[PDB]
Write a protein that binds this ligand. Structure first.
Ligand code: AJP
Lengths: 250, 378, 111, 105, 29
């Protein structure tokens, strides 16, 4: 939702001060022609609406002309930058890392109320991952949801002000699952691996283990990763991420 | 058109974009499994990248790893390079830090502690991998040798601004003509307080300067009549070096040689060229008309201002046809570059020294004009 | 093998002795493996600079793998990417550091 | 009240009026509304520049690979026939993705 | 610049047509 402070976007905040700072240096010279009145006569050279004090052939013609030549450059560039915001419209994600969740506090975040994902922040002695665990034990109401789809819904119900933490391959899949109003941001917080399990001492365990090192080497498992997340993915990422052809001014 | 397309160009992340675009070259090391992966991967994107890299000329397959780091830095973004992510973590920390890591891994490769196939010790070493990585100890050591030993930042990789606004530096080049325009105006206001207070040689001593400035207007007219070289025509193939020094009419080439190469193609542009010579000479012919009536003013100094106002007509009508003529040839010279100039194309495409001198020819036609009507006041 | 930041040389490597001459990521792990398995360790750089590839003519493993096959070395702690043919002669542990082909490009310029 | 409505037309957008509130409170009155009316016309062009660009940036599709690329325009065949059966049969990944979309359309 | 160069002939031709008016109006006075 835009508004007040977001009107100031196509001209930068340091330039909003310098368009006022360099303005008041202009009216001090035209006071010597006839400091007290020339600030309003610099408003005749602010953008338009021609003033009444006329520096005909002395040095004030350069003073009243070059700053007036300067201010016509901006309003063309401010419109050309405003057209760049009103056409491109890169709605950026606010966060990538979980260190930002230990940095901000507006967006709530939690895990499942049981599991190793909850237990990871309980276990991780890194000061960011402990501060997130320090926040989640103090996050009221309960950010620890009961089921996985409850955390999917609590992201959707709180509308961006709730974050949720689940595995990336499932975060691949649910981002493909419609209505597709959720996504995956950032990288993995740790290294977890799915492994094919056999009982200890089984004769089948070694050729199954070599088959993992063969099928993942050839990219066959990468091709099957394209199957059950992109050929079976409902929201094709380049097919659904290229869908915005919106309309008139807010 | 500038600020849109500058924000319409997205920085690439996936390697599918490298199979989609072709402006940025990309290659791997000239030996290794990373080169062999695209040779082996039957996915149509990874094969098309391998189809491009075998057709990428010159060789994107560099000899050493730091050569590919340099070829990214030397081609300045128009060369991509493919190496392992943990090394791409490390070199992004290594200064000058002008490289980065984009996107994810293209496959799954794993460093593993290797022991004698069957060695007893092999199992407690293997359980130690499943213990130290479980506790985050290896993640803490990952913070050591890439972030505690990383030279560029520890959290500064996300410190850059992504989608910011217009820069004050673009507005900063106009400040020196703003402040310098004010400081030059402070000199005029101080001397004119003395011109109100300190003070036939006025209307005649300035009118003879109008004759004197027209003389310089005739001299720099003939300076671009033979430009010594209009452009440093460079075809420096590292073949051999080619340094054409082509004039405005005589395309000389340089060891020393000179040729004409006048009246280039096409015929509708030749119709501009047969009109361009009309525009060049009517500048100089109507200069002489301006001299002849100002030589009659010397007889008055030995009608009057009525014929002198008639001379200020043709000195303006000289330079306006010269303002055609200065825009005939340079638009022609823009067109001949769009032909891809037959054998003399410049990579050092830069206008001649006499054409900056020919700029002074027109402003002396008009500085003569602003003071010959000052004597018309009386 | 000498790899930054996995095994690097000291600035006072002439002043230090043996395992202390070698710094890096694999050096901190080899202390922890000695903390887990209880052994004295000797960090040794491979001579040929190879990672343990296989020759196609002689079919002789050079590098660190051939030091493990031919009994020259006792264990390898190194940036060694797990392939099938390397496991065909020696035994890896679990992959502690998963990675892949990344895209190193330039950084958007401050011009 | 009687004349200043036409002198507010000098502050409508442009075309500077003749009544001059030099240093009293009318300078704020004649300035802020004039500052207000430049905001509306500056965003009006950049909205229209966003209009005429994207209207000409949208290309009419020629290949069916664009239908496997976009998803705003729905697409289907007859509910029986070889034309429906072609996408069911064609093993090319574009023609299968169109069949993947049409079974989910 | 050829987009700009097409406005030159109505610029210079507008000046040359204005030179005919200033010469005849000195005779109409
Ligand atoms: C210029 C060069 C160019 C190239 C080259 O030409 C010139 O050609 C190269 C050629 O390639 C040569 C290599 C050939 C392969 C050789 C392999 C040999 O090790 C072999 O045999 C064992 C060591 O002798 C290894 O494993 C030992 O060390 C541990 C490995 O992890 C084991 O765990 C341990 O087994 C157990 O031992 C008892 C305790 O339980 C524990 O300590 C241990 O768990 C083993 O130690 C010994 O264990 C005993 C019981 O097993 C046996 O003494 C024997 O194990 C078995 O060894 C069998 C071998 O036939 C034998 O049949 C069987 O009865 C034995 O029980 C082994 O010694 C085992 O992994 C391996 O196979 C190694 O030391 C030398 C070796 C690399 C040779 C070195 C020199 C070369 C490289 C040659 C040289 C470079």
């Amino acid at each position: 939702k835009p508004g007040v402070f977001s009107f100031l976007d196509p001209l930068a905040y340091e330039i909003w001060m310098c368009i006022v700072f360099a303005y008041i240096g202009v009216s001090v010279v035209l006071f010597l022609v006839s400091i007290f009145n020339s600030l309003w006569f610099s408003l005749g050279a602010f953008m338009q609406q021609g003033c009444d004090i006329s520096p005909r052939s002395l040095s004030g013609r350069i003073v009243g002309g070059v700053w007036w030549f300067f201010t016509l450059i901006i309003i063309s560039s401010y419109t050309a930058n405003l057209a760049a915001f009103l056409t491109v419209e890169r709605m950026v994600s606010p966060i990538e890392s979980a260190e930002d969740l230990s940095k901000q506090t507006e967006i709530a975040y939690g895990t499942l109320d049981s599991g190793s994902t909850k237990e990871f922040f309980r276990r991780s002695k890194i000061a960011v991952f402990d501060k997130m665990w320090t926040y989640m034990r103090s996050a009221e109401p309960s950010v620890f949801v009961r089921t996985t789809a409850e955390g999917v819904a609590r992201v959707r119900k709180s509308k961006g002000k709730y974050a949720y933490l689940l595995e990336s391959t499932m975060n691949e899949y649910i981002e493909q699952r419609k209505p597709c109003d959720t996504m995956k941001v950032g990288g993995n917080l740790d290294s977890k691996g799915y492994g094919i399990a056999t009982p200890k001492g089984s004769s089948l365990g070694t050729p199954v283990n070599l088959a993992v090192l063969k099928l993942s080497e050839q990219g066959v498992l990468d091709k099957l990763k394209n199957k059950w997340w992109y050929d079976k993915g409902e929201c094709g990422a380049k097919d659904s991420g290229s869908k915005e052809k919106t309309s008139a001014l807010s | 058109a500038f600020l849109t397309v500058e924000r319409m160009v997205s920085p690439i992340e996936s390697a599918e974009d490298l199979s989609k675009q072709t402006e940025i070259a990309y290659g791997t090391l000239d030996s290794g499994s990373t080169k062999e992966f695209f040779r082996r991967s039957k996915i149509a994107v990874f094969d098309k990248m391998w189809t491009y890299m075998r057709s990428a000329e010159p060789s994107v397959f560099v000899r050493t790893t730091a050569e590919g780091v340099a070829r990214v830095r030397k081609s300045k973004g128009k060369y991509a390079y493919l190496l392992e992510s943990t090394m791409n973590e490390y070199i992004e920390q290594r200064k000058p830090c002008d490289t980065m890591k984009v996107g994810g891994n293209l496959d799954s490769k794993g460093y593993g502690i290797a022991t004698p196939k069957g060695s007893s010790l092999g199992t407690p070493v293997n359980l130690a991998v499943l213990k130290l990585s479980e506790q985050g100890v290896l993640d803490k050591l990952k913070n050591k040798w890439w972030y505690d030993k990383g030279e560029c930042g520890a959290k500064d990789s996300g410190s850059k601004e992504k989608t910011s606004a217009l820069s004050l530096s673009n507005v900063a080049g106009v400040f020196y003509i703003l402040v310098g325009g004010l400081g030059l105006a402070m000199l005029v206001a101080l001397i004119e307080f003395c011109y109100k207070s300190r003070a036939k040689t006025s209307r005649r001593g300035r009118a003879l300067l109008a004759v004197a400035l027209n003389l310089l207007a005739l001299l720099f007219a003939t300076t671009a009549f033979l430009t010594t070289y209009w452009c440093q025509g460079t075809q420096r193939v590292p073949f051999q070096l080619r340094r054409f020094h082509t004039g405005i009419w005589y395309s000389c080439e340089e060891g020393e040689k000179c040729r004409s190469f006048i009246d280039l193609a096409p015929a509708s542009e030749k119709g501009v060229l047969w009109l361009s010579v009309v525009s060049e000479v009517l500048y100089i012919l109507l200069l002489v008309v301006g001299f002849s009536l100002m030589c009659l003013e010397l007889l008055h100094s030995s009608d009057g201002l009525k014929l002198n106002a008639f001379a200020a007509v043709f000195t303006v009508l000289s330079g306006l046809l010269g303002m055609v003529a200065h825009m005939m040839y340079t638009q022609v010279f823009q067109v001949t570059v769009s032909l891809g100039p037959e054998d003399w194309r410049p990579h050092s495409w830069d206008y001649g020294w006499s054409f900056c001198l020919a700029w002074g020819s027109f402003t002396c036609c008009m500085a003569a004009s602003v003071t010959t009507l000052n004597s018309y006041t009386k | 093998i000498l790899e930054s930041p996995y095994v690097m040389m000291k600035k006072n490597h002439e002043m230090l002795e043996g395992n202390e001459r070698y710094e890096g990521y694999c050096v901190d792990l080899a202390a922890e493996i000695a903390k887990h398995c209880g052994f004295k360790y000797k960090l040794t750089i491979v001579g040929d600079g190879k990672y343990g590839a296989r020759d196609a003519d002689t079919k002789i493993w050079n590098g660190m793998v051939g030091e493990l096959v031919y009994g020259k070395a006792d264990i390898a702690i190194a940036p060694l990417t797990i392939t099938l043919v390397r496991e065909e002669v020696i035994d890896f542990s679990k992959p502690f550091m998963s990675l892949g082909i990344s895209i190193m490009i330039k950084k958007p310029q401050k011009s």
